[PDB]
């Protein structure tokens, strides 16, 4: 039962989405910063 | 002694003997055929008639046709001269390279090594696969099980295990094709010929081939597993030498038998499998093991119908393994290879007093953060990435990285990924995950850890990633 | 229908159900329906709506679970029944 | 293989973005190729295309040259375009096949056509 | 030669012959009986014994009873004098109107047209039903199947199709009642005599009726379809006319087959059915067809037991259809009639080169917005519609007006809808939807598109609502 | 007549009788064994051969071993001297207190009372236990489903009932341990002795024990419910009493049935149960009703498979129930005893035409106030129990007084509780709660109603505690 949501569809694509979207910008957000450092 | 065929229904043929009745498990030669046709005595129906499963097609048999009892079970050629040669189910050579002039033949049927014969030694076997060696390490001379639904990576994974461990093996290795694709047999053969693990001009060949693929009637697929096992048996005993045994899909040993059960007159059991499913698998597995005479490092590929691990066939196969690497469509689907499940792959030596405390803690540390991350999969499935305390959303961010760092390019999978297969040393693997769990690389983007070798390339790639932006 | 799938949606919706009920209380203590909706297209309220929303959401999931479970058992019974008839047809064919 | 490069995972990766569809311009883009390529993949029956004709159109999409076009317009465009290459530029296609490869001069003569043809199309 | 019954089990009767063994399909007549009792030879058991199937009850039979070999399968009357009459499995009239004096007779068993007799002509058959007309048009000379669960809409639809099509038909029709409600034949019969498609005085009748309702034993219900089928074949071939063949529930033909298969000594297939479900069915459906010699527009109502479309029966029926109209209880329960599934009904005629690109482009517009609304139903049930984008809400809204605009009041159902029947033209249906999609009516309320004919009546009803 | 065992396949044995053949259900005695091995007839295979189900192991049996036809079915000792004694499946004492000296004997297989022997009056069997008698009355001669695992007051409610019914109805009780665990069977025996219901000295025992241990074969475990049934029948048809029959786990009876069925090679019905499910349940359940002479009410503990109420077993069992006593840990924790759920336990007889309008409106009022209070729980905790209107503050209070007044000290608890048990007459309970609902006792503290008997002890307990 740990991650049943994700082990399906409807709300999974969402969790999948928000997820990737987040870490998507974040990383770019972290990306240029790498340059700074 | 000569017998006559009295009934032919599929792979099941009835032969009646007037003289003497051959004992069960005895091989019978069907006379009058342009290709040796072996019939294995399966039962004694009574009234001097035995029932047998054909080791080939029955297309053409005639009621009354003669059948010569060879006196014993299927005996095949064993010994060093098999190395480099592709063998049949009944010992026939199928490489068109002529006969296999062997000086000894063993019966593919034999008793399993006694209990007093068991070995209790366990030495981790390093494979270069981070996930494997991290979470569920294989062990020297142990029984390795590779589970997986259709096309998730059983065949590619077992291939990597041969390109990694077999090529650098100081000894012989047996490979048995059990009801798979003949095309894969081609691939493996010519690819072993390239790497030089097989030599066609001399005697340096270090792997023996046994095949009985899909195009083959069940009867054959129902015994080849035992054939290949016999060849590796000789290498384990008559030498003691280290032997590696690769069987691509032992599941075809149980389906084979599931395809002839009824015709052997057997009420079907749960899920249609044979009632004898677990014990047939038992008198078959127990034979594939390390004794005090020598050691077998077996790697079996196990199919999982419709992806259901609870299916009788696979669920009965687990206890026969000392290390299991489970593949997951879900994981493969997230483009992570090998598609190994971190939460369902286990190993007997995964003990702190065998791999040390450092190795163990990190492994469980990986598994835990990955289980916690599954718990947040739900919570964030309705809320979004902006509700988790800075503490939780932090682990989510590490889960992703640890998840991605478990993936790894295979030398054998170049043609697929398009990248250069890497090979990771154990220590570099622990360090690798020890540091990520530490929080060190929380400033690096996840993608930096996806498909790489040691933890370094990660930073390096991460850099190549910073400059490109 | 497939026991494997139903079992997947039930777990998944039982989970959602738990999380939504929890949010209804937090809200109570303090997505908020068509609150942000209205003002844009054109606290007390905000929490009001959030309480309400999760509430309904909580019921809507339970009424959904209640329906999946019936389908669970119907389908659970059916699979056993199927497995058995298969088992016997083979025996009666011997 | 060239233009089809890594469009596949990219498309399957567009699906990852498909769950959303104030998007950030960036991801809005991942969702911008996938919606374009998709239309370029649709086709008519009993009218197969020479591998060279397919590369020509797939090229127009994969090289981002149609990213600022209205999806629903893509299909009407493939038609006009193709009928053009197949008409005026027999030789261009005549190459790509012969060498089954998009050479430098061919990657150029194609960027020349899609971008200008496309614009004349969005007149 | 004389045959004797050696065993009786329900509707399976073993008859042993001492001389001259009747071939398979041959129709045997049981002797010593009040009314004609036919047995159909199904197999040769060996030992000069044949296993047959009764076309009527087998009560009263006694072992040793004599059975005669007619020397031919079941032959029924075919020809113009069948029109306006009602006949049973074995062609006996059951309308209390005396013998049916036809010249020719025909075996109800025959081989299907050969591959060289096949027709490839596709030409829509507009029905006045927006959902069918729109998404899955029926084809003249085509095989239309109407799947539906217990009480969902099959009958009413077949009736409406007889209203909107049969009447404006220039030729002969054949209605085959198979395993359904007898009082329904009663209904049909009297509705036809009214409208006049059946005439008991002047010989102008245009409908031939074959019946074997749910009151009949398995052997009958298992062959009635072939009888109605055979009566349709005469009109098609031996007269070259456009023949309409309605069959209310061909599923009964299969169901029946299962009851007897049991008794025939056949190991049962999946779900208890007979092994021969597929073939048995094929050899029949294949005869229901248009050839070069003539046409047959067949409309078959198909029962879905336990509302399970995967059930071997219906499942196996789709491949035999040119058009499918799937009815849904969930849709019916939302009060949408006809409960046609916009996303599970198909037509080989839904091809732009055939119905035009304007028609095809709208059809796909509708199946796209509904499809997209359907994928949102997961979110709507848990987080309501406040969690949907502005874009989403828009489709949801248009889907709901499209769903309702898909309903329609049929004449044959006025009593349950409380609305006067409606017959919508094709262009009017294309138009009505092109508009709802283009957002042209995004200002009208849902309830305005529900149960109405053209789009115009969607607007009228809107004002009334104010 | 003597037979010879000719077939033994597990708990199934086929015996051949040369001359006189023993009818179905007739017990046969195996000859040549230490203990007694009974074989109950089940089928007449033909060829003077009969098939049977053994009531105990079949190891040792040999083909040819002699077997004796006992002339009738399994007969057991019936009458007063069975009370306090623990009887085996076949009638043997297993409490080692020697023989069961009875002058009477009866067959475990007896047809249910005929239609005329039926009671047409719906009377309520007063238990003296408030919740039961007020919210889910036990239909005299009716079956009641006892819901609740273990550790919820089951063994105490069972005996108390034994006590009450004895004190207020003179009828005895029998306990049929169907598929009991030898361990709990032992525990129950002594727990009863130390409770008074059983006396190993003076004939004051109120219950007869009958056991069907799990280690006992499916044949054995299937008949016990009947053995114990036959025992109870004596006290109803012979002493005109209103007996009480306890079947702990009616489920394991059912299951016991399927196993017999399977062993006999019968084809299972849906979900693997026996085809005979309903009849197996019919023949037995129907022997429990009110007869002109007296009546037998039975409390049968029920196990819902996979928590699925629709599973055949229970669903076949719910057809025979008139009431359900639901035990709840949630209730047991709050210290409320008996832990009978006041809202999940129910009765068919809880109808005006049956329990009187008065009694009805009271039970209903209590059910609705609890329902009202159970909802409030949310608001009370979250929104704070400070903004509760007058009508909202009384509900919670009264409900609590009710809820606790639903607790009752059992006479069988005296041994440990150190508190005189109470047996409340139906009259006292109705008025008690009838008033509480009015508000007549709102000027009293909660603990006043907790653990008491008649409403009187509520006020008396109130003053003392001030
Ligand atoms: N390590 C890998 N890297 C990339 N792709 C992989 C990898 N392993 C498997 N695949 C992909 O999955 C495909 C086939 O997997 P494969 O190893 O043959 O599966 P399998 O488990 O043997 N399936 P099967 O035996 O048919 O049930 C390949 O063609 C690849 O596309
Ligand atoms: N077009 C319709 N308009 C209104 N109500 C309808 C319509 N179609 C079906 N119904 C309703 O559903 C009922 C019965 O439908 P009916 O035509 O008999 O279904 P059926 O498919 O023939 N089912 P059955 O023969 O029992 O398997 C009618 O009484 C109506 O209430
Ligand atoms: Mg494979
Ligand atoms: Mg109907």
mmCIF file of C-alpha atoms in Angstrom, chain E residues 216-435:
data_model
loop_
_atom_site.group_PDB
_atom_site.id
_atom_site.type_symbol
_atom_site.label_atom_id
_atom_site.label_comp_id
_atom_site.label_asym_id
_atom_site.label_seq_id
_atom_site.Cartn_x
_atom_site.Cartn_y
_atom_site.Cartn_z
ATOM 1 C CA UNK E 216 -39.325 -22.753 -26.931
ATOM 2 C CA UNK E 217 -37.006 -25.628 -26.230
ATOM 3 C CA UNK E 218 -33.237 -25.322 -27.051
ATOM 4 C CA UNK E 219 -33.413 -27.147 -30.371
ATOM 5 C CA UNK E 220 -35.869 -24.595 -31.764
ATOM 6 C CA UNK E 221 -34.359 -21.398 -30.421
ATOM 7 C CA UNK E 222 -31.135 -22.911 -31.790
ATOM 8 C CA UNK E 223 -32.477 -23.089 -35.359
ATOM 9 C CA UNK E 224 -35.143 -20.362 -35.660
ATOM 10 C CA UNK E 225 -32.481 -17.915 -36.820
ATOM 11 C CA UNK E 226 -31.634 -20.241 -39.707
ATOM 12 C CA UNK E 227 -35.310 -20.309 -40.647
ATOM 13 C CA UNK E 228 -35.765 -16.570 -40.688
ATOM 14 C CA UNK E 229 -32.386 -16.558 -42.369
ATOM 15 C CA UNK E 230 -33.499 -19.014 -45.057
ATOM 16 C CA UNK E 231 -36.702 -17.010 -45.743
ATOM 17 C CA UNK E 232 -34.491 -13.955 -46.302
ATOM 18 C CA UNK E 233 -32.167 -15.869 -48.629
ATOM 19 C CA UNK E 234 -35.051 -16.703 -50.998
ATOM 20 C CA UNK E 235 -36.035 -13.099 -51.336
ATOM 21 C CA UNK E 236 -32.418 -12.158 -51.951
ATOM 22 C CA UNK E 237 -31.366 -14.773 -54.458
ATOM 23 C CA UNK E 238 -34.468 -16.346 -56.006
ATOM 24 C CA UNK E 239 -35.834 -12.868 -56.663
ATOM 25 C CA UNK E 240 -32.941 -10.425 -56.531
ATOM 26 C CA UNK E 241 -34.431 -7.756 -54.280
ATOM 27 C CA UNK E 242 -33.129 -5.618 -51.447
ATOM 28 C CA UNK E 243 -33.963 -7.642 -48.363
ATOM 29 C CA UNK E 244 -34.201 -6.311 -44.819
ATOM 30 C CA UNK E 245 -33.700 -8.960 -42.149
ATOM 31 C CA UNK E 246 -34.338 -8.044 -38.570
ATOM 32 C CA UNK E 247 -33.513 -10.569 -35.905
ATOM 33 C CA UNK E 248 -34.380 -9.696 -32.353
ATOM 34 C CA UNK E 249 -31.621 -11.436 -30.559
ATOM 35 C CA UNK E 250 -29.271 -13.752 -32.285
ATOM 36 C CA UNK E 251 -27.560 -14.251 -28.913
ATOM 37 C CA UNK E 252 -30.419 -16.639 -28.123
ATOM 38 C CA UNK E 253 -29.191 -18.837 -31.009
ATOM 39 C CA UNK E 254 -25.890 -19.299 -29.204
ATOM 40 C CA UNK E 255 -27.335 -19.560 -25.710
ATOM 41 C CA UNK E 256 -29.613 -22.300 -26.975
ATOM 42 C CA UNK E 257 -26.643 -24.026 -28.550
ATOM 43 C CA UNK E 258 -25.099 -24.249 -25.099
ATOM 44 C CA UNK E 259 -28.065 -25.995 -23.491
ATOM 45 C CA UNK E 260 -27.951 -28.853 -26.055
ATOM 46 C CA UNK E 261 -24.149 -29.014 -26.469
ATOM 47 C CA UNK E 262 -24.131 -30.149 -22.882
ATOM 48 C CA UNK E 263 -26.322 -33.143 -23.711
ATOM 49 C CA UNK E 264 -24.519 -33.895 -26.971
ATOM 50 C CA UNK E 265 -21.426 -35.255 -25.198
ATOM 51 C CA UNK E 266 -19.129 -32.322 -25.872
ATOM 52 C CA UNK E 267 -16.484 -31.307 -23.365
ATOM 53 C CA UNK E 268 -17.473 -27.667 -22.539
ATOM 54 C CA UNK E 269 -15.408 -24.657 -23.603
ATOM 55 C CA UNK E 270 -14.750 -21.440 -21.689
ATOM 56 C CA UNK E 271 -17.593 -20.219 -19.502
ATOM 57 C CA UNK E 272 -19.572 -23.403 -20.079
ATOM 58 C CA UNK E 273 -20.329 -22.731 -23.714
ATOM 59 C CA UNK E 274 -19.906 -25.277 -26.406
ATOM 60 C CA UNK E 275 -16.577 -25.715 -28.272
ATOM 61 C CA UNK E 276 -18.343 -25.025 -31.531
ATOM 62 C CA UNK E 277 -19.557 -21.583 -30.455
ATOM 63 C CA UNK E 278 -17.355 -19.822 -33.030
ATOM 64 C CA UNK E 279 -17.941 -22.202 -35.927
ATOM 65 C CA UNK E 280 -21.591 -22.921 -35.164
ATOM 66 C CA UNK E 281 -21.989 -19.124 -35.272
ATOM 67 C CA UNK E 282 -19.926 -18.641 -38.404
ATOM 68 C CA UNK E 283 -21.863 -21.071 -40.566
ATOM 69 C CA UNK E 284 -24.921 -18.918 -39.803
ATOM 70 C CA UNK E 285 -23.720 -15.344 -39.740
ATOM 71 C CA UNK E 286 -21.966 -16.005 -43.054
ATOM 72 C CA UNK E 287 -25.304 -16.736 -44.701
ATOM 73 C CA UNK E 288 -26.690 -13.455 -43.396
ATOM 74 C CA UNK E 289 -25.076 -11.418 -46.133
ATOM 75 C CA UNK E 290 -25.281 -9.439 -49.330
ATOM 76 C CA UNK E 291 -24.031 -11.116 -52.483
ATOM 77 C CA UNK E 292 -23.741 -9.985 -56.079
ATOM 78 C CA UNK E 293 -27.092 -11.660 -56.632
ATOM 79 C CA UNK E 294 -28.814 -9.327 -54.155
ATOM 80 C CA UNK E 295 -28.691 -7.364 -50.890
ATOM 81 C CA UNK E 296 -29.486 -7.974 -47.240
ATOM 82 C CA UNK E 297 -29.491 -5.156 -44.713
ATOM 83 C CA UNK E 298 -29.493 -7.140 -41.475
ATOM 84 C CA UNK E 299 -30.148 -5.659 -38.067
ATOM 85 C CA UNK E 300 -29.427 -8.021 -35.200
ATOM 86 C CA UNK E 301 -30.225 -7.339 -31.580
ATOM 87 C CA UNK E 302 -27.520 -8.902 -29.374
ATOM 88 C CA UNK E 303 -27.995 -9.729 -25.684
ATOM 89 C CA UNK E 304 -25.008 -9.281 -23.348
ATOM 90 C CA UNK E 305 -25.516 -11.674 -20.446
ATOM 91 C CA UNK E 306 -24.618 -10.200 -17.075
ATOM 92 C CA UNK E 307 -23.738 -7.021 -19.025
ATOM 93 C CA UNK E 308 -20.386 -8.567 -19.869
ATOM 94 C CA UNK E 309 -19.193 -7.664 -23.365
ATOM 95 C CA UNK E 310 -16.289 -10.091 -22.996
ATOM 96 C CA UNK E 311 -18.686 -13.027 -22.656
ATOM 97 C CA UNK E 312 -17.724 -15.526 -25.419
ATOM 98 C CA UNK E 313 -21.075 -15.004 -27.066
ATOM 99 C CA UNK E 314 -21.163 -11.237 -27.794
ATOM 100 C CA UNK E 315 -17.398 -11.065 -27.967
ATOM 101 C CA UNK E 316 -17.476 -13.567 -30.789
ATOM 102 C CA UNK E 317 -20.211 -11.545 -32.490
ATOM 103 C CA UNK E 318 -18.375 -8.293 -33.206
ATOM 104 C CA UNK E 319 -16.169 -9.692 -36.017
ATOM 105 C CA UNK E 320 -19.336 -10.602 -37.937
ATOM 106 C CA UNK E 321 -20.615 -7.025 -37.958
ATOM 107 C CA UNK E 322 -20.150 -4.119 -40.338
ATOM 108 C CA UNK E 323 -21.568 -1.743 -37.785
ATOM 109 C CA UNK E 324 -21.976 -2.020 -34.016
ATOM 110 C CA UNK E 325 -24.234 -0.012 -31.735
ATOM 111 C CA UNK E 326 -23.226 -0.722 -28.168
ATOM 112 C CA UNK E 327 -25.807 0.105 -25.542
ATOM 113 C CA UNK E 328 -24.808 0.838 -21.978
ATOM 114 C CA UNK E 329 -26.734 0.473 -18.730
ATOM 115 C CA UNK E 330 -24.618 3.221 -17.107
ATOM 116 C CA UNK E 331 -25.614 5.542 -19.906
ATOM 117 C CA UNK E 332 -29.250 4.361 -19.715
ATOM 118 C CA UNK E 333 -29.179 4.961 -15.951
ATOM 119 C CA UNK E 334 -28.207 8.587 -16.551
ATOM 120 C CA UNK E 335 -31.384 8.603 -18.575
ATOM 121 C CA UNK E 336 -29.647 8.859 -21.938
ATOM 122 C CA UNK E 337 -31.598 7.063 -24.654
ATOM 123 C CA UNK E 338 -30.719 5.509 -26.872
ATOM 124 C CA UNK E 339 -28.027 4.357 -24.433
ATOM 125 C CA UNK E 340 -25.518 4.265 -27.254
ATOM 126 C CA UNK E 341 -21.817 4.256 -26.257
ATOM 127 C CA UNK E 342 -20.224 7.031 -28.316
ATOM 128 C CA UNK E 343 -16.852 5.492 -27.545
ATOM 129 C CA UNK E 344 -17.564 1.832 -28.292
ATOM 130 C CA UNK E 345 -19.797 1.713 -31.338
ATOM 131 C CA UNK E 346 -18.219 1.376 -34.766
ATOM 132 C CA UNK E 347 -18.922 1.433 -38.505
ATOM 133 C CA UNK E 348 -16.692 0.389 -41.402
ATOM 134 C CA UNK E 349 -18.480 3.253 -43.170
ATOM 135 C CA UNK E 350 -16.962 5.857 -40.821
ATOM 136 C CA UNK E 351 -14.406 6.757 -43.499
ATOM 137 C CA UNK E 352 -13.933 10.298 -44.907
ATOM 138 C CA UNK E 353 -13.714 8.977 -48.456
ATOM 139 C CA UNK E 354 -17.221 7.599 -47.845
ATOM 140 C CA UNK E 355 -19.291 9.940 -45.665
ATOM 141 C CA UNK E 356 -17.281 13.052 -46.480
ATOM 142 C CA UNK E 357 -14.620 14.868 -44.482
ATOM 143 C CA UNK E 358 -17.095 17.261 -42.853
ATOM 144 C CA UNK E 359 -19.041 14.332 -41.455
ATOM 145 C CA UNK E 360 -15.936 12.366 -40.455
ATOM 146 C CA UNK E 361 -14.246 15.441 -38.970
ATOM 147 C CA UNK E 362 -17.209 16.213 -36.696
ATOM 148 C CA UNK E 363 -17.722 12.591 -35.733
ATOM 149 C CA UNK E 364 -14.108 12.500 -34.545
ATOM 150 C CA UNK E 365 -14.536 15.869 -32.889
ATOM 151 C CA UNK E 366 -17.327 14.391 -30.773
ATOM 152 C CA UNK E 367 -15.504 11.164 -29.942
ATOM 153 C CA UNK E 368 -12.517 13.285 -28.887
ATOM 154 C CA UNK E 369 -14.189 15.695 -26.485
ATOM 155 C CA UNK E 370 -16.183 12.849 -24.912
ATOM 156 C CA UNK E 371 -13.010 10.768 -24.761
ATOM 157 C CA UNK E 372 -11.219 13.683 -23.079
ATOM 158 C CA UNK E 373 -14.111 14.212 -20.648
ATOM 159 C CA UNK E 374 -14.063 10.528 -19.827
ATOM 160 C CA UNK E 375 -10.398 10.698 -18.870
ATOM 161 C CA UNK E 376 -11.230 13.539 -16.478
ATOM 162 C CA UNK E 377 -13.932 11.603 -14.667
ATOM 163 C CA UNK E 378 -11.230 10.217 -12.379
ATOM 164 C CA UNK E 379 -10.407 13.690 -11.081
ATOM 165 C CA UNK E 380 -14.044 14.867 -10.989
ATOM 166 C CA UNK E 381 -15.126 12.073 -8.636
ATOM 167 C CA UNK E 382 -12.551 12.917 -5.962
ATOM 168 C CA UNK E 383 -11.636 16.610 -6.255
ATOM 169 C CA UNK E 384 -14.734 18.020 -7.952
ATOM 170 C CA UNK E 385 -14.534 20.507 -10.806
ATOM 171 C CA UNK E 386 -12.802 23.259 -8.881
ATOM 172 C CA UNK E 387 -9.538 21.380 -9.468
ATOM 173 C CA UNK E 388 -9.859 21.519 -13.266
ATOM 174 C CA UNK E 389 -8.176 24.152 -15.398
ATOM 175 C CA UNK E 390 -10.322 26.721 -17.180
ATOM 176 C CA UNK E 391 -9.696 24.768 -20.365
ATOM 177 C CA UNK E 392 -10.898 21.498 -18.802
ATOM 178 C CA UNK E 393 -14.167 22.932 -17.470
ATOM 179 C CA UNK E 394 -14.872 24.066 -21.045
ATOM 180 C CA UNK E 395 -14.640 20.566 -22.536
ATOM 181 C CA UNK E 396 -16.520 19.013 -19.609
ATOM 182 C CA UNK E 397 -19.304 21.517 -20.413
ATOM 183 C CA UNK E 398 -19.322 20.860 -24.148
ATOM 184 C CA UNK E 399 -19.107 17.115 -23.524
ATOM 185 C CA UNK E 400 -22.219 17.280 -21.332
ATOM 186 C CA UNK E 401 -24.156 19.150 -24.044
ATOM 187 C CA UNK E 402 -22.869 16.724 -26.638
ATOM 188 C CA UNK E 403 -23.785 13.713 -24.503
ATOM 189 C CA UNK E 404 -27.291 15.037 -24.073
ATOM 190 C CA UNK E 405 -27.481 16.256 -27.634
ATOM 191 C CA UNK E 406 -26.818 12.618 -28.533
ATOM 192 C CA UNK E 407 -29.991 11.438 -26.814
ATOM 193 C CA UNK E 408 -33.169 11.610 -28.875
ATOM 194 C CA UNK E 409 -36.836 10.798 -28.447
ATOM 195 C CA UNK E 410 -37.986 7.802 -30.502
ATOM 196 C CA UNK E 411 -41.622 7.366 -31.466
ATOM 197 C CA UNK E 412 -41.655 3.780 -30.103
ATOM 198 C CA UNK E 413 -40.758 5.119 -26.646
ATOM 199 C CA UNK E 414 -42.957 8.208 -26.276
ATOM 200 C CA UNK E 415 -44.640 6.569 -23.277
ATOM 201 C CA UNK E 416 -41.371 6.520 -21.298
ATOM 202 C CA UNK E 417 -39.908 9.836 -22.478
ATOM 203 C CA UNK E 418 -43.092 11.878 -22.487
ATOM 204 C CA UNK E 419 -41.966 13.576 -25.658
ATOM 205 C CA UNK E 420 -43.211 13.363 -29.237
ATOM 206 C CA UNK E 421 -40.899 11.260 -31.394
ATOM 207 C CA UNK E 422 -38.160 12.773 -33.554
ATOM 208 C CA UNK E 423 -36.526 11.882 -36.863
ATOM 209 C CA UNK E 424 -33.362 13.949 -37.398
ATOM 210 C CA UNK E 425 -31.753 14.281 -40.833
ATOM 211 C CA UNK E 426 -28.039 13.702 -41.454
ATOM 212 C CA UNK E 427 -26.967 17.244 -42.340
ATOM 213 C CA UNK E 428 -29.001 18.515 -39.415
ATOM 214 C CA UNK E 429 -27.057 16.170 -37.123
ATOM 215 C CA UNK E 430 -23.683 17.117 -38.566
ATOM 216 C CA UNK E 431 -24.597 20.786 -38.179
ATOM 217 C CA UNK E 432 -26.031 20.491 -34.675
ATOM 218 C CA UNK E 433 -22.735 19.087 -33.429
ATOM 219 C CA UNK E 434 -20.292 21.162 -35.492
ATOM 220 C CA UNK E 435 -21.912 24.031 -33.626
#
